[PDB]
C-alpha cells in the first residue's frame, strides 16, 4: 500500500502500452533475488496490475527460466518434411487435425510435390471410400508409397478399425499414412495416442482472412460479367472477414459463437452471382445505383449469415453492417470501410476495377490491426487477453490428505453463508400486491436452497472428521467440490457457465443477505415498504419476474391494463433518491461501452460504467414513434451475454449515432 502510494510514476505505468516490459521494483525483500525470483514477483504484480498483460509476462517468465527463444520455433512455419522423414515411424499415422473451417491437405500435398512422392488422396465421405482407402493403403504399404484420408472424423468406427489394422507390422519403411480431419471429440482415443497429432489453425487477422477468401474463389468467377462483380466480391470478402474476426470476441461483438463458415460465404457468392446476372443481362458495366443492393442486403440478412442468428440484437448488428457496406456509396472513391480506426486513421476503400488491384490492396494492409477495424472498441483486445490469462490460470490449476483442507473450506463457507432466513410471508391481507407474491416466491426458493446447501455442507463437515457414514450423493458432491465444480444439485437458478464454487457461494451469500433485507422490510411495515426497496436485479433469482411484478403493481395502482404500460428508465445520481408512485429503484446495473449523464448516453473507451441507481418507471403508452436519437439497449443477466432480461430505451448524445452503439456491443448488465 505504501509502496504504490508513494510512487508517482505508478499511475503512468498503469496506463503504459506494455507494463510487463518495465515492472517497477515494488516487492520488499531482505536479500537480492535471482532473476527467476524477480520474474515471479513481476508476474504477481502483472496479475495484480493490468492482468491483460499476464500472457506477455508469462512469455517473459518462460524466456527468463527456460531461455530466450524457447517458443521461437513455434512461430516459424511447420517444416513437417523433417517430421515425415524422420521422427515418425511408418507404423504411426500422421494426424492432421484442423480447426473447423480450415483445410490441412494443402501442406501435405505440397510436401509430396516437392518430395516427388505421390499420394493416393481419398475422401472418406462415401461408403465405397472405405474399400478404396483399404486397397490404397494395402498397395502403398506393399510398394512403399503414401496414402491420404481426408475428413476421417466422419467415420469414428472405421477409424477404430483402421487403428486396429495398422497395429500389425508394416513391411515398408517409406510408407506414411496421413489422416486429415477436423477437431471433433468423435475421433477414437486410441488413434490419437498411436499417431502424431498436428493442429492447424487459420492465422488471425482481417488481412489473412481476406487473402484466404480471395485465394479460395477462382479467378474466373471474379473476373467475369460486369466489372462491378470484382468490387462486389471484395465487399463480400471484407464483410465475411469482419464478421469472422468479430467472433473471437465472443461476449462483446457476437453474443454467441456462430459458425459463419465457408458455406455461408459460398452461398453469398452464389447469391451475388445470380442477382448480378439477373440485373445485368449484358457484359457491359452497370451503374452502381443499378446494383440490386436491396436484394443482396435482404438475402444476406435473412437467409445467408442470418439463418443461424437467433436473438434480435445480433440480427440488428448484422443489419447495421450490411446497410453500411452494401450500398451504392461503396463504389465511390471516398468510401470508408472502417472509421475512427486507431483514433483518426480510416480504412479507405481501394480505387480499383479488377481483382488484381483489390488483392494488391489486401496484401498492402498494415499489420497493426486493432479491434477498431471490426468496429469493436480497442479495449476488447485487453478484455480478451485478460480472459485468456484467466483461462491459462484455470488450466494450470486443473493440471495440479484432502480431508483437512475440505473441512476448513466448508467451515469457512458455513461462517460466510448466512445461517437461516424464515418464510415471513403469506398474509391474507394485502396479498393483492404482485410484489408481495413475487418476493414470497423468491424468499421461499432462497430459503429452500439455503437449507439444502447448509445441510449438505454440514454433512461434508461431519464426514471430514469421519463422524458419520458417506453416501453416493455425498460422494458426488464432495468430488465436485474437491475438483472445484459447483454441484449440479446446488444450481437451482441461472448461473454463468464455468462458475467456480467459491464465486457461487459468495454470490449466494449476497443473495441471501438481500433476501433477509427484503424479509426485514416486509416485517417492519408490510407490503407498502416492499415497493420502496432498491433491489438489485443480479441478486434476484429471476429478474424478469421482478419486472413483471413491477408492471402488474403499476397497473393495479391507477387500474390500468398491462398492455398499456411501457417501461421508462431514468438513471439518478443518488443511490437513495426518492421514488414516485411508479419508479422502482434498481441497483447494480453496469453499463458497458458507454457512460450515461443526465439520462444521455455517450460512447466511452472505459468498460463497465456502473449505474448509480436505475429508476424503472411504467407510464401509460402514448402511442408515439420513438425519435431517431434513442437506442434500444439490451439488459443481459451476467457478463456472458446469454440471457436477456429486458430492453431499455436511452437517449444518446447528439454527436454519436445509434449504429455506433449497435456495432460496439453496448449493453447493460445486471451483474
Amino acid at each position: 500500500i505504501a509502496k504504490v502510494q508513494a510512487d508517482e510514476q505508478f499511475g503512468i505505468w498503469l496506463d503504459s502500452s506494455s507494463p510487463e516490459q518495465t515492472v517497477p521494483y515494488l516487492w520488499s525483500e531482505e536479500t537480492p533475488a535471482t532473476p527467476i525470483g524477480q520474474a515471479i514477483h513481476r508476474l504477481l504484480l502483472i496479475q495484480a496490475f493490468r492482468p491483460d498483460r499476464l500472457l506477455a509476462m508469462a512469455h517473459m517468465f518462460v524466456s527468463t527460466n527456460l531461455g530466450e527463444s524457447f517458443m521461437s520455433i513455434m512461430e516459424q512455419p511447420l517444416d513437417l518434411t523433417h517430421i515425415v522423414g524422420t521422427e515418425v515411424k511408418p507404423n504411426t499415422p500422421v494426424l492432421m487435425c484442423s480447426v473447423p473451417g480450415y483445410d490441412a491437405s494443402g501442406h501435405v500435398e505440397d510436401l509430396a510435390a516437392e518430395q516427388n512422392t505421390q499420394i493416393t488422396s481419398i475422401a472418406i465421405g462415401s461408403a465405397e471410400g472405405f474399400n478404396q482407402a483399404d486397397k490404397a493403403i494395402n498397395t502403398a504399404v506393399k510398394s512403399g508409397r503414401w496414402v491420404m484420408l481426408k475428413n476421417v472424423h466422419l467415420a469414428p468406427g472405421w477409424l477404430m478399425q483402421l487403428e486396429k489394422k495398422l497395429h500389425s507390422l508394416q513391411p515398408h519403411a517409406c510408407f506414411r499414412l496421413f489422416l486429415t480431419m477436423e477437431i471433433n471429440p468423435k475421433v477414437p482415443v486410441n488413434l490419437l495416442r498411436a499417431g502424431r497429432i498436428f493442429v492447424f489453425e487459420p492465422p488471425p487477422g482481417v488481412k489473412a482472412n481476406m487473402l484466404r477468401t480471395f485465394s479460395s474463389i477462382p479467378v474466373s468467377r471474379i473476373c467475369k460479367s460486369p466489372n462491378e462483380r470484382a468490387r462486389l466480391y471484395f465487399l463480400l470478402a471484407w464483410f465475411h472477414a469482419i464478421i469472422q474476426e468479430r467472433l473471437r470476441y465472443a461476449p462483446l461483438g457476437w453474443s454467441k459463437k456462430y459458425e459463419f463458415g465457408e458455406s455461408d460465404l459460398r452461398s453469398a457468392c452464389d447469391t451475388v452471382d445470380t442477382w448480378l446476372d439477373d440485373t445485368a443481362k449484358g457484359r457491359q458495366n452497370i451503374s452502381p445505383d443499378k446494383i440490386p443492393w436491396s436484394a443482396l442486403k435482404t438475402l444476406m440478412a435473412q437467409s445467408i449469415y442470418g439463418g443461424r442468428v437467433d436473438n434480435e440484437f445480433d440480427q440488428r448488428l448484422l443489419n447495421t453492417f450490411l446497410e453500411r457496406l452494401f450500398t451504392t456509396r461503396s463504389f465511390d472513391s471516398e468510401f470508408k470501410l472502417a472509421c475512427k480506426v486507431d483514433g483518426h486513421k480510416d480504412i479507405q476503400m481501394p480505387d480499383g476495377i479488377r481483382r488484381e488491384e483489390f488483392v494488391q490492396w489486401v496484401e498492402l494492409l498494415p499489420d497493426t490491426q486493432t479491434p477498431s477495424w471490426l468496429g469493436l472498441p480497442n479495449n476488447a483486445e485487453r478484455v480478451l487477453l485478460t480472459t485468456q490469462g484467466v483461462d491459462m490460470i484455470s488450466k494450470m490449476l486443473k493440471m495440479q490428505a484432502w480431508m483437512r483442507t475440505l473441512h476448513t473450506t466448508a467451515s469457512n463457507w458455513l461462517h460466510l453463508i448466512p445461517q437461516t432466513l424464515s418464510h415471513l410471508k403469506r398474509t391474507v391481507e394485502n396479498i393483492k400486491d404482485p410484489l408481495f407474491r413475487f418476493f414470497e416466491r423468491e424468499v421461499k426458493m432462497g430459503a429452500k436452497l439455503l437449507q439444502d446447501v447448509r445441510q449438505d455442507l454440514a454433512d461434508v463437515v461431519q464426514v471430514c472428521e469421519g463422524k458419520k457414514k458417506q453416501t453416493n450423493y455425498l460422494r458426488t458432491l464432495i468430488n465436485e467440490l474437491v475438483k472445484g465444480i459447483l454441484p449440479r444439485s446446488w444450481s437451482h437458478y441461472t448461473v454463468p457457465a464455468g462458475m467456480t464454487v467459491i464465486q457461487w457461494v459468495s454470490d449466494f451469500s449476497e443473495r441471501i443477505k438481500q433476501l433477509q433485507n427484503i424479509s426485514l422490510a416486509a416485517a417492519s411495515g408490510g407490503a407498502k415498504e416492499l415497493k420502496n426497496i432498491h433491489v438489485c436485479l443480479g441478486g434476484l433469482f429471476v429478474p424478469e419476474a421482478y419486472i413483471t411484478a413491477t408492471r402488474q403493481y403499476v397497473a393495479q395502482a391507477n387500474s390500468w391494463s398491462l398492455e398499456e404500460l411501457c417501461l421508462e428508465v431514468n438513471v439518478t445520481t443518488s443511490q437513495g433518491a426518492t421514488l414516485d408512485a411508479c419508479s422502482f429503484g434498481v441497483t447494480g446495473l453496469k453499463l458497458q461501452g458507454a457512460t450515461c449523464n443526465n439520462n444521455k448516453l455517450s460512447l466511452s473507451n472505459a468498460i463497465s460504467t456502473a449505474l448509480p441507481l436505475t429508476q424503472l418507471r411504467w407510464v401509460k403508452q402514448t402511442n408515439t414513434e420513438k425519435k431517431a436519437s434513442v437506442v434500444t439497449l439490451p439488459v443481459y443477466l451476467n457478463f456472458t451475454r446469454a440471457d436477456l432480461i429486458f430492453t431499455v430505451d436511452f437517449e444518446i448524445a447528439t454527436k454519436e449515432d445509434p449504429r455506433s452503439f449497435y456495432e460496439r456491443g453496448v449493453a447493460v448488465l445486471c451483474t
Binding site: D278, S303, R308
Partner: protein
C-alpha cells in the same frame, strides 16, 4: 398370405401353384407326424430331414419371389413405398374389394382418405378428403378397363392432378371477375366459395391478388402518378369486410373453414399491399415486390404441372397440384415470411432446410405450410421413439420416386446410431439433389440417382428433405441451410385468428391475451399438465369464437355487435384452464385476469338442470352437496367441470392427490346423467397395472397366429358388437390406477381424433360415440406429454374434499346403513352422542391437525386415520349391541351409552 385373399392367385399364379404343392407335402408330413408325435418316432421316419430341407429352400425361394413382386409393385406405383409390406400384401390381395383399400389411402396420398366409386365399384368417380370434401373427376377412370392395381391407381392420380388444374382454371376465371369489381355481392361470393375446394379457393385468391398487384405495378412505371395500388387495397378491404360479415352468421363447418382460410390470406395480402408495397414502390422488378410469394397462372400451357408457377425472390416452383383436403392454414407472420424465403432459397440452391429452434415455435408446421403452398405431399417423421429403419428406408425411396417432401420433427431426438444412419441416407439423397443442378450438367440426360436400399433409385427434382432441430450432424453441415425459429409472433397469430373468428376488436384482444398467457406460464406454479403454448392459445381462440357464435344464436332467437368480447374471451380462457388448475393457482389465475382484463368478470354456467340430479344422487348416496361457498361447493364444481370436458371430448383424465373426491365425482355424474337423460350408465373400472400389457390388450400366438383379446380390447369389442344393446347406454372405461408410457402406447391412437384402436393382428376397432375413456390417476408424474395433451383434464386437489364432508358422510352412513333395527337404533344413538365432536372446530378436527405435526412411521394420510377411526367407532357400536344382547333385561341406558361412546371416541382417536 395365400388364403386370406382371393386375388392373390391371379397376380402370382405359378408361385401359387408351387406353394400349393409345398402345402400338400407339408400337410402330408404333418399328418404323418400326428400319428406318432414321439420325438424318436418322428426322427426315425424315412427322410424327414431331406424333405424338410427341400421345403425350407422352396419356401425361401418363393419368399424372395414374393418380395420381388412386391418391389415391382412399388416401382410401378411409387406411392406404394409409404405403406408397409403387410399393408401392400393386403392392398394387392384385396384389390377386388375396395373397402379394405380405403384404410390405406390416408398413407399414400396427402388429403385423399377415400375414393368415390360407382354402384358396382367399377369406375372411380372421384376422391374424398378426410373432412368430407369431395373432388369429382372431370373424366372418371374405370377399374374394369384397367384391372391391375398399379395402372388404375396411376390413372386416378393423374386424373386427380388434371381435375385440380381444371378447377383452378375455372376458379381463377371467376375470381378475376370478383377482384376487378367493388361492393361484392355476398351471395355470389358465398356460392363461389361453396363451389370450389378450400385449397382451390385460397389458391385462386392468391393468384388473383398477385396478378392484380403485378398489373398495378406495371401500370405504375412512371411513378406514383395514377396509382391503382390503392384500388387493389380497397378491393382487398371490401373482400375482407364481406368475409367478416359472412363469418358472423351461421355457416356449415366446411364453409366456415374456407371462410377463415380466406380471411387469413386476405389479411396477409392487405398487410403486404398496405405497407410492404405502398412505400413509394412503382417498379415490378423491385426486390420489395420480388421478395413476396408471387403466383403466375398460364392456363394456355398443356401440361398440368406447368400451368401454375410460384416464385419467391429468384426461386421458381411449379405447383404440384396434390389434393390436400382442408388443412389448417398458418397465419403468415413475418417469421413465417422469413422461413418461406430462407427455405425457398435453400431449395433453389438444392440444399436442405434445418429450421432449428425451441419446441413449439411452429418449425414443422411452417415446413408443412410451405410444402402445402407449393402443392407437394409433405410427410412428418416424428422421432419420439416412434421410429424405425424398415419403414424409413422405403419412405426415402418413395420420396425420391414420387417427388414428395420429408420433414423430421426433431432430428436430435434420434438415438446415436439411428441418427448416424439416417444422416448417411439423407447425405446420399442430398448429394443426389446437389448433382441434379450441376452447372455443367444442367441438362440432365442420364438420370440422377442415389444409393438407397442397396439399389439405384431415381431422384425427383421436386423432392426435398427438411431437418428440424432444437446441432446438425457433421455430414449434413455443408448441405443444409439453418434457420433460427426461436420466437413466434403470437400477438399477430392471435389477432388474425380472432379477426377470422368474427371478433371486431381482434387487435386489443390479442394484445391482452398473449401477455396474459405469458404471465400464466410465469406467475402460476410449475406443473406437468400445464400447457400455455401456441397450440393452447389457438384452441382457446377457437373456443372463444364458438362461444361468441353460440351467444349470437341465443340472442337472435329471443347487428348484435354490442357483445362484451373481452367477457367472452375470458369465459373461454376460464372454461379451458380452470379445470386443470391446482387449488393454489385459481386465485392467481383470477388475479392475473383482473390485471390484464380490468373490471371484466367471469360468470360460470348455472346448469340448474343437472345440479338438481346431482343433489338427489348425493342425498341417496350419503354424500354432501353445496352450491359455491357452501360445504361441498368445490366438489360439485369439479363434478360439473368433469361433465363439461365429458361433453367437449372423449378420453378424460381426472388427476388429484389420493384422498380427493375423484371416484365419487364421476360415479355421481354417471348416476345423475342416467336419471336426467334417461340413458343407462355402465362403468368398467380397469386397473392397468394389476395385469400385464399382453393381458391388458391381448396376445398374438407366435406360431398359431391366433389372436385372443385382452381386457380392454375385449371390453371394446363387446361394446362394439352390440349383442345385448350396450349402445344407447353410456359406457365409461375408467382406468383406475397409475399411468406410464408403457400401457398407454396402444391407447394414444384412441385418445386422439382417430378414435381408432389398431390391434397387432390387423383388426381395427372404432370407438363408438357413447364411450369415454377416463384416467383416474393420482400424481401424473410418469406420463408422456403425448397422452396428457390428447386428454381433457380435471384436477381434484385435496382442498376440494374437506374434512367436514368426510364427517358428514360417516355420520349419515352410521345413521342409515346397519352394521349388519335395534342395531340401527344403537347406531343412531351413538351418532347423536358423538355428533358434537365431529364439528368444524371440534375435538376430532383439532386432534387431526395436531397429529399431522407429529412423526409417523408411515406418511400420515387423512383418510387412512379417518377410516381407522370410523371402523373403531363402528366396533364401539357393535360392542354396545353385544352388551345389549348379553343383558336382555335392563339394556344399555342413555347415560351409560353416552359415557361409553364419549370415552371410546377418545380411545379411538
Amino acid at each position: 398370405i395365400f388364403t386370406g385373399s382371393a386375388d392373390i392367385k391371379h397376380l402370382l399364379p405359378v408361385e401359387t401353384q408351387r406353394f400349393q404343392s409345398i402345402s400338400t407335402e407339408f400337410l402330408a408330413l404333418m399328418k404323418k407326424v400326428s400319428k406318432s408325435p414321439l420325438v424318436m418316432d418322428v426322427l426315425n421316419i424315412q427322410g424327414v430331414q431331406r424333405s424338410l430341407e427341400r421345403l425350407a429352400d422352396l419356401l425361401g425361394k418363393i419368399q424372395k419371389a414374393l418380395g420381388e413382386y412386391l418391389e415391382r409393385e412399388r416401382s410401378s406405383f411409387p406411392r406404394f413405398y409409404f405403406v408397409g409390406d403387410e399393408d401392400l400384401l393386403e392392398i394387392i390381395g384385396n384389390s377386388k374389394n375396395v373397402a379394405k383399400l380405403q384404410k390405406h389411402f390416408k398413407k399414400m396420398f396427402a388429403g385423399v382418405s377415400s375414393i368415390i366409386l360407382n354402384e358396382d365399384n367399377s369406375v372411380v368417380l372421384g376422391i374424398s378428403s378426410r373432412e368430407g370434401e369431395e373432388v369429382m373427376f372431370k373424366t372418371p377412370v374405370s377399374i374394369t378397363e384397367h384391372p391391375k392395381i398399379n395402372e388404375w391407381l396411376t390413372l386416378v392420380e393423374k386424373e386427380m392432378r388434371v381435375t385440380l388444374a381444371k378447377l383452378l382454371a375455372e376458379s381463377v376465371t371467376e375470381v378475376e371477375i370478383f377482384g376487378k369489381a367493388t361492393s361484392i355481392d355476398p351471395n355470389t361470393y358465398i356460392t363461389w366459395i361453396d363451389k370450389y375446394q378450400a385449397q382451390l379457393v385460397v389458391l385462386s385468391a392468391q393468384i388473383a391478388w398477385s396478378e392484380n398487384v403485378e398489373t398495378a405495378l406495371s401500370s405504375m412505371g412512371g411513378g406514383g402518378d395514377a396509382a391503382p395500388l390503392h384500388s387493389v387495397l380497397s378491393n382487398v378491404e371490401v373482400t375482407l369486410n364481406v368475409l367478416a360479415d359472412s363469418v358472423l352468421m351461421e355457416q356449415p363447418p366446411l364453409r366456415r373453414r374456407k371462410l377463415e382460410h380466406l380471411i387469413t390470406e386476405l389479411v396477409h395480402q392487405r398487410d403486404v399491399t398496405r405497407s410492404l408495397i405502398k412505400s413509394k414502390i412503382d417498379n415490378a422488378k423491385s426486390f420489395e415486390w420480388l421478395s413476396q410469394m408471387r403466383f403466375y397462372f398460364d392456363p394456355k400451357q398443356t401440361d398440368v404441372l406447368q400451368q401454375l408457377s410460384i416464385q419467391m425472390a429468384n426461386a421458381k416452383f411449379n405447383y404440384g397440384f396434390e389434393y390436400l383436403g382442408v388443412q389448417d392454414k398458418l397465419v403468415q407472420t413475418p417469421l413465417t415470411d422469413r422461413c418461406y424465403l430462407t427455405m425457398t432459397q435453400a431449395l433453389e440452391a438444392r440444399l436442405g432446410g434445418s429450421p432449428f429452434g425451441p419446441a413449439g415455435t411452429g418449425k414443422t408446421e411452417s415446413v408443412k405450410a410451405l410444402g402445402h403452398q407449393l402443392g407437394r405431399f409433405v410427410l412428418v417423421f416424428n422421432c419420439d421413439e416412434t421410429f424405425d429403419f424398415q419403414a424409413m428406408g422405403r419412405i426415402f425411396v418413395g420420396l425420391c420416386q414420387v417427388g414428395a417432401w420429408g420433414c423430421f420433427d426433431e432430428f436430435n431426438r434420434l438415438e446415436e446410431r439411428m441418427l448416424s444412419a439416417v444422416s448417411q441416407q439423407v447425405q446420399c439423397i442430398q448429394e443426389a439433389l446437389r448433382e441434379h443442378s450441376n452447372p455443367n450438367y444442367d441438362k440432365t440426360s442420364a438420370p440422377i440417382t442415389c444409393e438407397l436400399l442397396n439399389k439405384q433409385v431415381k431422384v425427383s427434382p421436386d423432392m426435398a428433405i427438411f431437418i428440424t432441430m432444437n446441432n446438425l450432424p457433421d455430414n449434413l453441415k455443408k448441405l443444409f441451410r439453418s434457420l433460427a425459429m426461436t420466437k413466434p409472433d403470437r400477438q399477430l397469430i392471435a389477432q388474425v385468428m380472432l379477426y377470422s373468428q368474427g371478433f371486431r376488436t381482434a387487435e386489443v384482444l390479442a394484445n391482452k391475451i398473449v401477455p396474459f398467457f405469458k404471465l400464466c406460464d410465469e406467475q402460476l406454479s410449475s406443473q406437468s399438465h400445464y400447457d400455455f403454448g401456441l397450440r393452447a392459445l389457438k384452441s382457446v381462440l377457437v373456443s372463444a369464437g364458438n362461444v361468441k357464435r353460440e351467444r349470437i344464436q341465443k340472442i337472435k332467437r329471443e347487428i348484435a355487435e354490442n357483445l362484451p368480447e373481452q367477457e367472452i374471451l375470458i369465459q373461454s380462457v376460464c372454461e379451458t384452464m380452470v379445470p386443470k388448475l391446482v387449488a393454489e393457482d385459481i386465485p392467481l389465475l383470477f388475479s392475473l385476469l383482473s390485471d390484464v382484463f380490468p373490471g371484466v368478470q367471469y360468470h360460470r354456467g348455472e346448469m340448474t338442470a343437472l345440479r338438481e340430479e346431482l343433489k338427489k344422487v348425493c342425498q341417496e348416496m350419503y354424500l354432501t352437496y353445496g352450491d359455491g361457498e357452501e360445504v361441498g361447493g368445490m366438489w360439485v364444481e369439479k363434478v360439473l367441470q368433469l361433465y363439461q370436458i365429458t361433453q367437449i371430448n372423449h378420453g378424460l383424465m381426472m388427476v388429484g392427490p389420493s384422498g380427493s373426491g375423484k371416484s365419487m365425482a364421476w360415479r355421481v355424474l354417471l348416476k345423475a346423467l342416467e336419471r336426467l337423460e334417461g340413458v343407462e350408465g355402465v362403468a368398467h373400472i380397469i386397473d392397468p397395472k394389476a395385469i400385464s400389457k399382453d393381458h391388458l390388450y391381448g396376445t398374438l400366438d407366435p406360431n398359431t397366429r391366433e389372436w385372443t383379446d385382452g381386457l380392454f380390447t375385449h371390453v371394446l369389442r363387446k361394446i362394439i358388437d352390440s349383442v345385448r344393446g350396450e349402445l344407447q347406454k353410456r359406457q365409461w372405461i375408467v382406468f383406475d390406477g397409475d399411468v406410464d408410457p408403457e400401457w398407454v402406447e396402444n391407447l394414444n391412437s384412441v385418445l386422439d381424433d382417430n378414435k381408432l384402436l389398431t390391434l397387432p393382428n390387423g383388426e381395427r376397432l372404432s370407438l363408438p360415440p357413447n364411450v369415454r375413456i377416463m384416467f383416474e390417476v393420482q400424481d401424473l408424474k410418469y406420463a408422456t406429454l403425448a397422452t396428457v395433451s390428447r386428454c381433457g383434464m380435471v384436477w381434484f386437489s385435496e382442498d376440494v374434499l374437506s374434512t367436514d364432508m368426510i364427517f358428514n358422510n360417516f355420520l349419515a352412513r352410521l345413521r342409515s346403513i346397519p352394521l349388519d333395527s335395534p342395531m340401527l337404533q344403537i347406531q343412531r344413538d351413538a351418532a347423536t352422542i358423538m355428533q358434537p365432536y365431529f364439528t368444524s372446530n371440534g375435538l376430532v378436527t383439532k386432534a387431526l391437525e395436531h397429529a399431522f405435526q407429529l412423526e409417523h412411521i408411515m406418511d400420515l394420510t387423512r383418510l387412512r386415520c379417518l377410516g381407522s377411526l370410523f371402523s373403531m367407532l363402528h366396533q364401539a357400536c357393535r360392542n354396545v349391541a353385544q352388551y345389549n344382547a348379553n343383558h336382555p333385561d335392563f339394556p344399555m341406558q342413555i347415560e351409560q351409552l353416552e359415557r361409553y361412546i364419549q370415552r371410546y371416541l377418545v380411545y379411538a382417536i
